Design a binder for this molecule. Sequence first.
Ligand SMILES: CCCCCCCCCCCCCCCCCC(=O)OC[C@H](COP(=O)(O)OCCN)OC(=O)CCCCCCCCCCCCCCCCC
Ligand code: SF4
Ligand code: SF4
Lengths: 76, 114, 115, 207, 100, 178, 114
Amino acid sequence: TLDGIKDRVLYVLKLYDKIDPEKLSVNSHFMKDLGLDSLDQVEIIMAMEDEFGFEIPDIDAEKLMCPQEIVDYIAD
Amino acid sequence: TSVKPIFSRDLNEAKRRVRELYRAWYREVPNTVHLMQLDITVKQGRDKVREMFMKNAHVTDPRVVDLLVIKGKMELQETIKVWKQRTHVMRFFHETETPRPKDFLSKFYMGHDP
Amino acid sequence: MNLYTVIFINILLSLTLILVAFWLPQMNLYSEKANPYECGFDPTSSARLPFSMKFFLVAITFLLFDLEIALLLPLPWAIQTIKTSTMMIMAFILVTILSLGLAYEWTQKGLEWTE
Amino acid sequence: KRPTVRPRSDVTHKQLSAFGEYVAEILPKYVQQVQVSCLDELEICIHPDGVIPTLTFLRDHTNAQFKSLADLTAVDVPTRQNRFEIVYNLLSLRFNSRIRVKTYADELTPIDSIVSVHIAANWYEREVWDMFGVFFFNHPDLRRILTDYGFEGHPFRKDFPLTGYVELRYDDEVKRVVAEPVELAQEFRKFDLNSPWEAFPAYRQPP
Amino acid sequence: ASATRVIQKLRNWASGQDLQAKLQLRYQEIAKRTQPPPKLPVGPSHKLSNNYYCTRDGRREVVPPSIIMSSQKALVSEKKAVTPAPPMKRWELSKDQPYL
Amino acid sequence: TYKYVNKKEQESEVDMKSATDNAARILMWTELIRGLGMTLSYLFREPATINYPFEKGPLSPRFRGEHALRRYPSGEERCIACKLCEAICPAQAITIEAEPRADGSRRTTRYDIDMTKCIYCGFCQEACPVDAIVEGPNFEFSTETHEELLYNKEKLLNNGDKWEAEIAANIQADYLYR
Amino acid sequence: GLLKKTTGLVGLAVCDTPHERLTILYTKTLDILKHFPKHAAYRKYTEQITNEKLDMVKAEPDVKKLEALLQGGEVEEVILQAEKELSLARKMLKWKPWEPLVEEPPANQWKWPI
Ligand SMILES: CCCCCCCCCCCCCCCCCC(=O)OC[C@H](COP(=O)(O)OCCN)OC(=O)CCCCCCCCCCCCCCCCC
Ligand code: SF4
Ligand code: SF4
């Protein structure tokens, strides 16, 4: 279950249509290196909720800042 | 300084509500283009949402932000329901108003306005 | 074939009339006139959705009473029989049974609607 | 005795001054500036925090059974920093009398709602929010009533133009009732009517 | 007015009461349409003497409202309770038609 | 004083006669035959309608309808551009633009009335100090164009020269009241 | 006298046993006003009122004479008002209205004309 989430999330990212995945990685931050403000991050989190089938609040979402943190979240 | 709040101890606790509202709008757009048969794509509806959000990003007073959140929830109520028609929603896009020229010389060619 | 003929005549009248109604006039079709009425504003949902009926028990007992009609209706022929006592008693029993059922439904508030 | 002028009594004035002292000394945490006019209309003015207690008092008190809400207005005065003067006209039906409770607000200093006291205040609070922009706490709906759905603006504010900022008309290009900006074929003709003479010395403002 | 005296009877029976006297229409019992000229009267203040506008002005007899318990000034609000007015005396039941 | 409309004085007096009367009210629809008889009575009355174009509704001299700009018996134009018919017009329907006439006279170069803003209130004619603009009897000036209902000095003067024979009489009848 | 089968007001029952419910409610008011402080005015005035009405109840046993002496319409309206005054007394115990004025306003606030 674990390492499928990695490429799953990464495919969602690639389809996000605004990140240009040539820079992209799993430890890739969103704010600093990619310059994506909070609303784009919210769109990303919705894409993850669409991939899975469980809702999640905005506090967890703002604790998340990169795909690895997302993967670490899907466990719990 | 030394003023009362409304729903927000600080600006971060207001941005929380802001993001909840952005979320509700993002999840509502695909249903509104479907229920009342709009002739747009979901992409540009959500781009309009982000545009009308970034129309007010300069603000820093929490109270103003809370009131804007309230009015956004009102518009979201009106749009989730069909109290408002295709006319009102497509009013946002300005599909008939020619672009106000943001250049000096054009304004000089037409009008005395600045 | 007389009756078949009368009915075909009425059928063809109706169809010729609809043909005239459709292909005689002028048309200016567009999506804003061909969409459902709902009093000036637009509908909030589809009309092909559940309409809760609140007299369904009344409908079913109407069905059973329809069968009771079907049983009562042979009486004009049942009266030219020689007995004229068995049919009397049996029709009495049928009608009284139907009235008893109606009374039970009435008292148990089946003729009232499901608020 | 003079026919053209309006008759005058004093017993109503005295009664209402007495009841004003009553409310003033029974409810001091909130009350400001009780006043009774030439025409005998009692008028109590209240801190915005005192709204529910004062209205519940005047509804449920025995010597003040003001259990009917007639109006709930607002009045924009751009001068004072707390613009919107909010008004509560009431009547008793036990004493055949009226009273007026007043509070103040601003664009960002809202007020508690009154549906917990007077259910009649629901649509009036909605009207006040729509017209003047006063938000009301713990209100059930609090949406617009009178303005169009896609409408930005609080029209009865004094800084709002009479003619508005948008105008409607149907367009064949899009087959909708679009909203263009405003362009009138005849400007509203503002008339400068006020006379330059003190008509009423009794209200003369000193410098 | 013209109802041939048997249709009059029919309508007065079906209705329940004589309506030839109380008709919905108007024939000659109305105020006619060209009339004599009037001479409208003239109210007081036309006295021609002992009539000065300062004595019968109403628009100037007003004052700003009286004030009790102004927080600005230093005003002060055994003492018996008070009503805004005496209780509204109960209504009496009618005499021409109390129970319709 | 007050009175009850649907309050029974007191109940509980019934015998077989009253029961028969109530049971005959029921089962015969007796209180419905009265409605049938009422509508039948109305079938045999003179209807209140009128052959409109040929016979019309009664009006009074005070009736206020289409406007007009009047003249003196000398034919002199009666308005003087005192510009208060538009001061009081609560719809802002009237415009005036005035000049000297080259005779040396206070007269208008403009008198427009957007009759799509007029509310037909009469304030202009009870404000004019010379009985120049009036509100006449014509109520039959419907049009197929918005632009026709936007009047000017010439149209109002045409109305006046048309309807003077009526307006003079209406004024003669109604003055001593105004 | 009798039971007045119809009180004219709608939604209001009849209270077959008055002269008791009023004693209950007024005694309860009196017992709750003891928790108010002495300097409060609501305590004093409501005590005066409830004592007068309790004396009226103790004096007159006839419902019609009691109504005409106790100017509050029918006796059921009076009972409703007693319940509602009791509710108010509790609410005022929670609110503490007797305190001094909080946050006197700006000067040009009630000044009119302006
Ligand atoms: C020898 C011994 C044996 C003899 C056995 C015979 C005994 C006598 C039998 C008499 C029975 C007559 C039939 C009566 C049927 C109606 C029953 C009835 O009660 O009225 C029904 C309805 C009720 O009205 P309501 O006031 O609400 O009372 C109901 C309370 N539960 O009220 C209504 O229906 C009114 C609503 C319908 C209104 C429709 C408009 C009617 C207009 C009247 C036109 C009349 C013309 C009829 C001409 C017919 C020609 C074919
Ligand atoms: S009030 Fe009479 S005189 Fe004056 S401008 Fe109007 S029409 Fe002319
Ligand atoms: S009748 Fe009234 S609204 Fe019409 S033009 Fe005269 S003043 Fe204006």
